[PDB]
Structure formats: structure tokens, C-alpha cells
Amino acid sequence: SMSYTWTGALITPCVYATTSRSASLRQKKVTFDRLQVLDDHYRDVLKEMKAKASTVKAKLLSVEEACKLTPPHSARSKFGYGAKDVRNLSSKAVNHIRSVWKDLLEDTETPIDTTIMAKNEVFCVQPEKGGRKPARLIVFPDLGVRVCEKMALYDVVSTLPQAVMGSSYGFQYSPGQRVEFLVNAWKAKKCPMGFAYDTRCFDSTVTENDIRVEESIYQCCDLAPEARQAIRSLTERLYIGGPLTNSKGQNCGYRRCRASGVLTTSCGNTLTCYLKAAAACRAAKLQDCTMLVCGDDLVVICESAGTQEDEASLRAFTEAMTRYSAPPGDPPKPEYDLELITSCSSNVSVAHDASGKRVYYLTRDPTTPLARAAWETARHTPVNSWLGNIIMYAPTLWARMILMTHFFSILLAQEQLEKALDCQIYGACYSIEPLDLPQIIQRLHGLSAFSLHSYSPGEINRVASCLRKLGVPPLRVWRHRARSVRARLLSQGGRAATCGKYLFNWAVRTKLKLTPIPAASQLDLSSWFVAGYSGGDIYHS
Numbered sequence: 001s002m003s004y005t006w007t008g009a010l011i012t013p014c015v016y017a018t019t020s021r022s023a024s025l026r027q028k029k030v031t032f033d034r035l036q037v038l039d040d041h042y043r044d045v046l047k048e049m050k051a052k053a054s055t056v057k058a059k060l061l062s063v064e065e066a067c068k069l070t071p072p073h074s075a076r077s078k079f080g081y082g083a084k085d086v087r088n089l090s091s092k093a094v095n096h097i098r099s100v101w102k103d104l105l106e107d108t109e110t111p112i113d114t115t116i117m118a119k120n121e122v123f124c125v126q127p128e129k130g131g132r133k134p135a136r137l138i139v140f141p142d143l144g145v146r147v148c149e150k151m152a153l154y155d156v157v158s159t160l161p162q163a164v165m166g167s168s169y170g171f172q173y174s175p176g177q178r179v180e181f182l183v184n185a186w187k188a189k190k191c192p193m194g195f196a197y198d199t200r201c202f203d204s205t206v207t208e209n210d211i212r213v214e215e216s217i218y219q220c221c222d223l224a225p226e227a228r229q230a231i232r233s234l235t236e237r238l239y240i241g242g243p244l245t246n247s248k249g250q251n252c253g254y255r256r257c258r259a260s261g262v263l264t265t266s267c268g269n270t271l272t273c274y275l276k277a278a279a280a281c282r283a284a285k286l287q288d289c290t291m292l293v294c295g296d297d298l299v300v301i302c303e304s305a306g307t308q309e310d311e312a313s314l315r316a317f318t319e320a321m322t323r324y325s326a327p328p329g330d331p332p333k334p335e336y337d338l339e340l341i342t343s344c345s346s347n348v349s350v351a352h353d354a355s356g357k358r359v360y361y362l363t364r365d366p367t368t369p370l371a372r373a374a375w376e377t378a379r380h381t382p383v384n385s386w387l388g389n390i391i392m393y394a395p396t397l398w399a400r401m402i403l404m405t406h407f408f409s410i411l412l413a414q415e416q417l418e419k420a421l422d423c424q425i426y427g428a429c430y431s432i433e434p435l436d437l438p439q440i441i442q443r444l445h446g447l448s449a450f451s452l453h454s455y456s457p458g459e460i461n462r463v464a465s466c467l468r469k470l471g472v473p474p475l476r477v478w479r480h481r482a483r484s485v486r487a488r489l490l491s492q493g494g495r496a497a498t499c500g501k502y503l504f505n506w507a508v509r510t511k512l513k514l515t516p517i518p519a520a521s522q523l524d525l526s527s528w529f530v531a532g533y534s535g536g537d538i539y540h541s
């Protein structure tokens with residue numbers, strides 16, 4: 001069946017930000033027929049996944065618990081209330097949510113309406129290898145339905161993926177634990193080989209049968225009878241597909257693939273990608289596989305069988321993935337150095353701590369993080385990706401020298417150091433105090449994140465080159481600015497002095513002794529690395 005059918009009505013509007021002007025180019029790419037052929041390997045992996053899902057007991061969330069996970073700036077309902085009303089448990093909001101819930105229990109078939117929109121995402125104007133990327137498309141149901149999804153499935157999508165996939169489930173790890181997991185898996189092989197597998201338009205490759213297969217996994221949980229019906233109804237009325245309405249309320253088309261803006265997008269994609277990849281590992285006869293899956297992003301670390309044998313096994317993996325309706329964008333390449341693998345735009349790199357010990361960390365090309373940080377400072381945004389970047393890429397040369405220096409200088413100048421910020425980190429939105437950054441960094445990356453030095457020449461060159469092309473002052477200017485920020489922070493005492501001491505020890509010759517931060521343990525990060533919620537409309541204060 002077609003991933004999408006279109007009526008002809010346009011997807012109307014809500015360095016460079018993507019707009020609805022490029023939506024037709026994205027519609028062309030994501031529209032195609034899916035061919036799917038299943039085999040014994042697929043069926044065996046599925047049964048194994050279901051036997052693990054059978055150990056899960058999931059709870060139904062109350063209206064209040066579901067309302068309190070709603071982000072403050074979540075899209076307004078068409079039924080006369082917004083995210084603020086949901087969060088305050090207003091009578092209008094709650095009564096509409098209860099009626100949506102009852103309708104899910106009573107109506108098992110009627111397709112639920114969704115809104116289709118072009119995303120406004122910032123990318124950097126690079127006229128070199130290729131041109132601008134068209135806008136990504138977001139498909140989401142009404143606010144009342146989103147609250148109901150949380151009631152039925154929040155506990156499922158938060159608990160089931162780790163129970164089913166174990167150590168392969170990518171969202172359970174902090175950046176420090178992810179690097180450790182990867183390095184240990186790499187070291188455990190006699191002769192390691194690794195590859196990233198990039199599916200072309202993953203969301204469109206997800207068939208109606210794939211979505212029913214996901215439901216079959218959720219249905220293995222011990223569930224309240226209303227949760228069982230709500231999941232059943234949501235699968236048929238929303239998850240498998242449905243009508244698409246534009247921002248002007250016009251009938252836009254019909255979807256028969258994954259909706260990007262539903263609670264199950266991340267969980268469903270991870271489970272589907274994992275099922276297809278684990279079965280393809282068996283078809284390709286890959287030896288001693290370690291997989292790591294984050295939605296459609298997949299990496300396999302295995303035992304090498306030789307140069308030509310590895311090339312042949314990867315061709316067989318791709319053929320199996322293609323039969324499962326997951327063909328690649330670029331064909332996978334075998335890598336024999338862990339640093340050469342790029343997944344989720346990131347790679348593992350090497351540095352040394354204060355003692356000279358070799359430490360590993362995840363990095364990425366800083367162009368998009370810097371362009372996005374520049375965009376957000378230039379235009380007032382409710383969500384700020386720069387803080388997420390400082391947190392997730394804290395050990396990197398670029399997050400420390402540029403991002404920390406620049407934003408702490410702004411916060412000092414504005415006297416806003418104490419002000420909590422809403423920051424979108426991948427999936428879930430969090431309210432974070434910048435003065436808590438040293439404690440957060442220590443917990444996610446370890447104490448070594450404040451003492452890394454002796455970065456790789458290739459990493460240094462990528463940062464320096466990125467600064468030049470974007471018109472950003474060189475690293476020496478950042479060192480000078482960091483020394484002033486550091487001095488101003490220390491002079492303030494308290495948490496500000498802790499920021500000055502730990503975040504900017506790199507900027508001074510006479511270095512301070514960085515001991516474990518006292519505050520660190522008491523920090524509540526219990527809901528940080530549980531599960532993925534990208535497109536799932538999730539908020540944590």
C-alpha cells in the first residue's frame with residue numbers, strides 16, 4: 001500500500017530554516033508503495049521479543065498524571081482549550097479528555113483526524129556537497145488524544161522497550177554509559193567490525209502490519225481492560241494510519257505509515273528497527289552481534305569474518321532489511337576502527353584526562369549545533385537547543401570553548417544565571433537551571449569531562465574549520481572570553497563559583513583541583529535515561 005495518498009491541497013504554513021515551501025519535495029520522497037516479505041528469522045525474533053514483553057505489567061495513568069506530562073507550549077486543542085488549561089486541570093480540558101477516552105473505549109474503527117505540518121528546522125547553508133534539505137513533515141493528533149495516549153501507553157513506552165531489547169535499547173544510557181557500552185562491546189570482539197545502517201525514509205517504510213506487530217508486543221503486557229481497549233482502538237484508528245488535515249483545516253491526504261507525532265513513534269520505531277535488524281543479522285549470518293538501536297538509528301558491532309566475507313555479509317543484511325521493507329539510504333560500510341562509525345550524527349573520539357589516562361567520548365560536527373545556537377539567540381525561542389548541546393556534548397572541545405563560554409557570558413550580562421530554561425533534549429522537554437550544569441555534567445559524563453585535553457588533530461581541525469566557515473571568532477578568542485567569564489563566576493561564590501571552577505578549568509594555566517561535586521548525587525535524574533519520547537509530547541520539570 002502507499003505510505004501516503006494526496007488530495008492536491010497544500011501542506012500550508014503553521015543560516016536557513018526549513019519551511020512549507022519545500023514540503024512538496026519531501027512529499028515526493030516519502031510517498032511510495034511498500035513491499036514486505038517476512039520469513040522464519042523475522043518470526044523467531046518476534047516470538048523472542050514477545051516472550052520478554054510478557055514479563056511487563058503496565059499501569060494506566062490517571063487524567064492528572066497524563067495532564068502533568070503535557071509540555072506548557074504543546075499545540076492547542078481544536079476543542080477550545082490549550083496546554084496551560086490541561087496542565088491546570090481546567091474543567092473544560094479534563095471533561096474533553098474524559099470524553100475522548102470514553103470514545104476510544106466505545107468506538108473501535110473510526111479513523112482519528114491528524115494535522116500535517118512542515119517542520120521549521122535550522123541547518124547550515126552549505127552549497128558544497130549537495131543542496132538544501134526539504135522540510136521534514138510532522139503528523140500529530142489533537143491535544144485531547146495526546147493526553148489519552150499517555151493514559152493508555154505512557155507506562156508501556158517507558159518500561160517495555162528495555163524489558164524487550166535489554167542492552168540494545170539505546171535510550172536507557174547517559175552519554176557516559178553509551179560510550180562505555182560501545183567501547184566494551186568493541187573490546188569484547190576478537191576481530192571487531194562495525195557498521196551503521198541508515199534506512200531511507202524509515203517512517204514511510206513502517207507498514208500497517210509493522211504497526212499491528214508492535215501492538216502484538218504491547219498486548220503481551222499485563223494491562224487494565226480499558227488500557228487494552230484504548231491500545232486496540234488507538235492502533236486501528238490512529239497508529240496504522242488515517243486522514244491528514246492541513247493548518248487551514250483542509251483535507252490533505254491519507255497516511256498508511258508511521259505518524260511522527262504520536263506517543264509510540266520512538267518506542268514503535270525502536271522495536272520495529274530492532275526486530276528487522278536482529279532478523280537480518282541471522283539472514284546475513286553475522287557472528288556475535290551487539291546491536292544498539294535509537295528509533296531508526298542502528299549500529300551493529302560483530303566478529304569479522306574477513307574483508308570480502310564482511311562485504312558479502314553486509315550485502316545479505318541489506319537484502320534481508322529490504323525484504324522487510326527497510327531499504328537503506330546509503331549502503332552500509334564495514335568499519336574496523338570504532339571512531340570511523342557515525343550514528344545519530346555522532347562518533348566516538350579519544351582524549352586524555354588530567355592523569356594522562358585515555359578517555360572516550362561522543363562528538364559530532366559542530367556546524368548544526370552552532371547555527372542552531374546562533375538562530376536561537378537572534379530570535380526569541382521558547383525552547384533552546386544550545387543547553388541540550390552543552391549537556392549531551394559537555395566533554396567536546398566545541399561545547400566547552402564556544403557554547404559554555406558564549407552562553408555563560410550572556411547569562412552573566414543579563415543576570416539570568418538563576419533562571420530555569422525549557423530545553424528540548426531529543427524527545428522529552430525539561431526545565432533546567434544553568435547553575436546545576438556541573439552536577440548534571442558529572443552525572444552524565446563523569447568528572448573527566450572537566451579535564452579532557454590532548455584532543456585528536458582531526459577533531460581540532462573539524463572545530464577550527466567550522467569556526468572559519470561560520471564567521472565565528474577563533475579558539476584563542478574563546479579562551480580569552482572564558483577567562484573573564486570564569487573570573488566573574490568565581491567572584492559570585494556559591495553555584496556560580498562551582499560553574500567557574502569546573503566548567504572553565506581548561507581556560508587557566510594554574511588549574512584548580514577538581515574533586516567530585518558534593519551536590520551531584522542529590523540531583524534527581526531518575527526520568528532522564530529511561531526511554532525515548534521524540535514526537536511523544538513529553539515534559540519533565
Ligand SMILES: O=C(O)/C=C/c1ccc(NC(=O)C2(NC(=O)c3ccc4c(C5CCCCC5)c5n(c4c3)CC(=O)Nc3ccccc3-5)CCCC2)cc1
Pocket residue numbers: 015370371372373374377402403406470471472473474477
Ligand atoms: O584574529 C583575532 O585575533 C580575532 C578575531 C575575531 C573575529 C571575530 C570577532 N567577532 C566579534 O567580536 C563579534 N562576534 C562574535 O563575537 C561572535 C560570537 C558568536 C558567534 C556565533 C554563534 C556561536 C555559537 C553560539 C551562538 C553564537 C556565530 N557567529 C558569532 C560571532 C558569527 C555570526 O555572525 N553568526 C553565526 C551564524 C551561524 C553560526 C554561528 C554564528 C561581536 C561583535 C563583532 C562581531 C572577534 C574576534
Ligand SMILES: CNC(=O)c1c(-c2ccc(F)cc2)oc2cc(NS(C)(=O)=O)c(OC(C)C)cc12
Pocket residue numbers: 170171174175178182194292293294297298299338341342343344346347348362363392393426
Ligand atoms: C545507535 N546509535 C546510538 O545509540 C548513538 C551513537 C553511536 C555513535 C557511534 C557508534 F559507533 C555507535 C553509536 O552516537 C549517539 C549519540 C547520541 N547523543 S549523546 C551525545 O547525547 O549520547 C545518541 O543519543 C540519543 C539518540 C539518545 C545516540 C547515539
